[PDB]
């Protein structure tokens, strides 16, 4: 698996995250991505839009560490990536 | 008894009956078969550039029940009812019950992984009542009954470190092995249950009140002292005195002194600039033991890590919890926004501030030729007529610790808070009895192929606590723990939209006050 | 009783109560269905160029419990507590229990091999209390309860040799067949259990002490004897005497003699050159029986295989164990580094050395014309006023042997050590009751297709031992068995990183001393 | 199965052992070898590196007999070899 870490600051917070998997399949075969927020600041109320898509949209991000875990699977091919976001 | 009859019932409750309160908790646990039924000798060398990290020990195939966290017995609301009304409390008894056991066999033939239940399999269970095994329960480790009652938890694996030789991974001729199958245990099939009772030894009440007076200013501000003080020498060297006036606390004679202190470094949370790009470790407080250097949070009792209305924290004199539970072995860099940083600011009237010097004293001998000189100190231990407040207990923190058997100790009160016990609630160990796979021929070599399986069941803990009734004559209203949030986006101490339990703040225990 | 209720509990323990000690052991066993439910007549001709290897006998479909090894009842540490403090011990009683049985059916349809449990199947169990069957237990064979409690073991298959004719594979008209289904047995389903008690017959205490004096030097070294001795003849042939002086042990008159000895060959372990490229067999000690030549280790009691502080061992007078358990029928060539070679050097003050001549004696009749001549001997049996020490018991060795019923024996103490019993703990046999496959038509021919299955369960053995308290007046400190290792890489008598139990040394029984 | 026996002497001890199986498969199919130490001297503390590989590395070998058992399996083809090492 991977471990791509991103960072942001200032008042702006709403951000979107895509998903990149190795061994890309044919057009006829699309995967069903799945995002799981495993760690977030204690204040974070926020929401998650388009989890099952390639891009998860985040809004209302309070300062702290955010831990995600996108899981990409298909026909005889399970997988997943990891991503950390740090807000100041 | 039997397969189609339940071996116990669900009890969650709190019964307040004057001077007592009885809490009951039931949870559902799951137990994996650890190590595949065998003992392994585990060990480590110097990790992260520190040989204090080296060890030698054993993992076993047993798991254990750990209910040494307050939130395992108290709901947020009963905790609030306790800290807003009582001056103290202490544990009196304990009753534990394991019931409704279910062993499941797991078979993964042709990637189908089917789970069936095995009605004839057993789990073994015993309590170490004579404290013959390394007691690992009161050391701030995970795996306790969860805070929230609907949560299902995995029991942790029992393991222990024994002696390693010269800060390396090797054992010494004194390193011991403890075989847990060498104790008598009960075997339980799906219709069986295990029950166990315990009484705590008389311990002092925890003090759930804050001091309403400062220790150095106990004299009446209206009367002068009949004691005098040296204030200077005249142009000839003759000594002069002055009477200690009314309310001049910087000079009065004192009868009592603040508790012991060892200076810790202070850092600013939120607003407040700190030194940039620092690496704590290299400059943290350490104690040497057997040739190695160990960090010693939270430092010994008797200090305050924060000064009320300030954002400077002596971080290593602090208990730092996470707002939520984490995965095993995470190396993520959490920020202040993710933590539940505790503050002992309500002990400041009696406990010295950890990031400040502790005082000063004479360094020389004055004479006609030398002027009196003084020098500050960074650490000061116990002196006679010393008083301090022990660390507070939090809802998300530990209830007790075992006092180590060495024959010599001073004031057995654990650094992390809670009760220090000579004989604490015995460890309860549990494991899935092994079931051999298909074996067709004889061999003197031990069987190594087992049917894979796991168990699950319910566990009920019932604790009786004794309370110390608050008896104040304060006139004006007191501070109380209260549910105060400005524009809540979610209810705190409740499940959110996802179903995960939220907790945004550590709840200590000192809201009520008392005059010293 | 029932499927969802356990039939017994786990007990492992040691309870020392003065003059007694009670050991309890529980293990998990697995039982294969042997031979596919049938008796077979097994046999062999002359194997490896030796017709002493020929036999004729029967294998049965039964397995048996064997707990005739000390490590099945004693932990390394309790063994140490016994040999450092007592002068002797002997077994008093035995209690056995078989419980928590589980029969599993195995089906291999389409290479899926699924294991399901069969709730209605039985195991048969009985004890041969009148010793009507060939007793195979005390003959140094494998399959005993394991040393380490978490280990799961396979029960061995019962088999026996009867009489063969003329050192060939053929039976004689006296060869007997014993059908074990011809005894009354209990049948146990998954809710049943079997229990059995036994009392040992009064036996002599084992002697767990070493002699503090040499048998030939019991006279007071300060006083002379009032006895004289022939020392020569003068130039005329007249005999001359000399008084036996004080401390000249080479000449004193003796009252007692060392035990019997039969010279064995001595080999050097470690440092110490031996004859290169040898083939032991051709020159080992043998005894003839029925026309065949058998090796007879460890030789009869009364000798010492090693001389303290020497590396020469009379290897065939020695008990040689392996540091670990081996697979069935291994033909590997082990070296000294893999073995646990025992030494009886602490009996040297009383037992003759096996690789040396036993003494000498007159071969002729001297006269004026012939000079006295003498000749050494290599074997010498019992004489009156003979004393020796029996072989020692080791933790990894055998507890008892059955004394063969023949009506005539001398000093029934087994060569391999332990107690010799007229009526030893009866054999406990067990087997999976056969369950027929799908049979659709009638036949007078016996059914030969069965459902394949196996069983497993727990077994608890409880033995009471009587101790002989050490009563010494020695002033200086004694030798004790102690955990001494220079730079341990692992803890001995503990599981290693893999989970396999390690044992690097044989632990005998003589540490304490006594004056003769 | 086979039974290749090797021998060594002197102070040197660290040695490596490869694995040879008959009926070698295509490049696209690699097997997962597995080594098991079934017999070793009572003093042997040592370690085993790269068990699941073709070459198992041994270090800190004390005098005595060492028994190994490499097992090579794949798609419809289970197998195994045996090897004895004797140190003087």
From Swiss-Prot, chains A, D:
Tissue specificity annotation: Expressed in cortical neurons in the brain cortex (at protein level).
Compartment annotation: Cytoplasmic granule membrane; Golgi apparatus membrane; Golgi apparatus, trans-Golgi network membrane; Cell membrane
PKD domain ranges (all copies): 1-88
Domain of life: Eukaryota
Post-translational modification: N-glycosylated.
Positions glycosylated per UniProt: 84
Role of this protein: Possible role in axon guidance through interaction with RTN4R. (Microbial infection) Acts as a receptor for adeno-associated virus and is involved in adeno-associated virus infection through endocytosis system.
Subunit structure: Interacts with RTN4R. (Microbial infection) Interacts with AAV-2 VP1.
Protein name: Dyslexia-associated protein KIAA0319-like protein
Name of encoding gene: KIAA0319L
Boundaries of the shown chain within the full protein: 312 to 399 of 1049
């Amino acid at each position: 698996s991977a471990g791509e870490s991103v960072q942001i600051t200032l008042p702006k917070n709403e951000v979107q995250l895509n998903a990149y998997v190795l061994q890309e399949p044919p057009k006829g075969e699309t995967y069903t991505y799945d995002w799981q927020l495993i760690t977030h600041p204690r204040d974070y109320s926020g929401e998650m839009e388009g989890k099952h898509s390639q891009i998860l949209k985040l809004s209302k991000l309070t300062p702290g560490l955010y831990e995600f875990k996108v899981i990409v699977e298909g026909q005889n091919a399970h997988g997943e990536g990891y991503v950390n976001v740090t807000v100041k | 008894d039997g397969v189609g009859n339940a071996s116990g019932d669900w009890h969650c409750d709190s019964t307040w009956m004057g001077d007592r309160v009885v809490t009951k908790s039931t949870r559902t646990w799951v137990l994996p078969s650890y190590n595949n039924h065998q003992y392994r000798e585990i060990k480590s060398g110097s990790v992260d550039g520190s040989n204090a990290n080296a060890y030698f020990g054993y993992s076993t195939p047993w798991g254990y029940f750990d209910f040494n966290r307050f939130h395992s017995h108290w709901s947020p609301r009963d905790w609030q009812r306790l800290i807003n009304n009582y001056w103290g409390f202490r544990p009196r008894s304990l009753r534990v019950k394991i019931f409704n056991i279910q062993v499941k066999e797991v078979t993964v033939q042709d990637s189908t992984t089917t789970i069936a239940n095995n009605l004839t399999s057993t789990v073994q269970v015993f309590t170490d009542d004579d404290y013959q095994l390394p007691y690992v329960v009161g050391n701030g480790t995970e795996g306790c009954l969860p805070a929230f009652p609907p949560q299902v938890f995995t029991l942790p694996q029992y393991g222990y470190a024994t002696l390693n030789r010269d800060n390396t991974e090797n054992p010494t001729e004194r390193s011991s092995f403890f075989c847990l199958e060498y104790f008598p245990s009960k075997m339980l099939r799906t219709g069986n249950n295990f029950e166990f009772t315990y009484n705590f030894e008389e311990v002092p009440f925890h003090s759930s009140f804050a001091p309403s007076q400062n220790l150095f200013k106990l004299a009446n501000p209206l009367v002068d002292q009949y004691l005098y003080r040296f204030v200077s020498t005249n142009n000839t060297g003759g000594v002069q005195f002055n009477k200690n006036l009314a309310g001049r606390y910087a000079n009065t004679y004192k009868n009592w002194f603040p508790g012991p202190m060892g200076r810790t470094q202070g850092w600013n949370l939120g607003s407040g600039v700190n030194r940039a790009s620092v690496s704590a470790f290299a400059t943290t407080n350490r104690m040497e033991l057997e040739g190695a250097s160990y960090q010693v949070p939270p430092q010994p009792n008797g200090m305050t890590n924060n000064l009320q209305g300030s954002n400077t924290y002596a971080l290593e004199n602090t208990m730092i919890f996470n707002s939520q539970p984490a995965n095993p072995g995470t190396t993520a860099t959490y920020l202040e926004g993710n933590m539940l940083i505790t503050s002992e600011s309500e002990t400041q009237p009696v406990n010295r501030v950890a990031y400040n010097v502790g005082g000063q004293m004479a360094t020389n001998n004055q004479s006609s030729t030398t002027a009196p000189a003084t020098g500050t100190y960074n650490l000061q231990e116990i002196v006679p007529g010393s008083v301090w407040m022990e660390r507070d207990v939090y809802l998300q923190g530990p209830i007790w610790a075992k006092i180590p058997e060495t024959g010599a100790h001073f004031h057995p009160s654990p650094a992390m808070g809670g009760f220090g016990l000579k004989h604490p609630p015995p460890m309860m160990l549990i494991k899935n009895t092994p079931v051999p796979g298909n074996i067709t021929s004889f061999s003197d070599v031990p069987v190594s192929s087992f049917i894979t399986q796991y168990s699950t069941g319910q566990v009920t803990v019932e604790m009786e606590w004794e309370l110390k009734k608050e008896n104040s004559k304060r006139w004006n209203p007191e501070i109380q723990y209260t549910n105060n949030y400005n524009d809540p986006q979610f209810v705190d101490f409740a499940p959110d939209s996802t179903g995960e339990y939220r907790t945004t703040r550590p709840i200590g225990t000192r809201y009520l006050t008392r005059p010293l």
